């Protein structure tokens with residue numbers, strides 16, 4: 755599923771991401787935009803053989819099992835394919851574990867390079883939330 759901007763903001767809000775660990779909703783929508791272009795089916799392979807999955811591009815080296823990333827951990831205890839669902843619940847629950855990991859949202863390279871220090875509130879402007 756490809757989300758609309760406000761549609762995603764609302765879904766994320768409903769799932770408790772708004773100000774989760776101090777990150778306003780705009781941060782999460784911005785990260786999703788540049789990670790996946792709001793497409794839950796986004797996948798991308800990394801040079802190390804791991805793969806990023808879903809709307810927040812969660813990586814198979816640490817967070818999910820895709821059966822083809824040798825010596826990886828499955829810290830969110832889920833098949834990576836569950837991250838590609840139109841229901842973002844698994845992605846959001848796993849993201850909460852990631853953002854709690856010590857580095858905050860810096861774990862998402864696109865957030866660090868493209869959202870961090872920008873006016874992120876613009877990503878939820880105009881939305882009925």
Ligand code: NA
Nearest residue numbers: 814818826827
């Ligand atoms: Na893994």
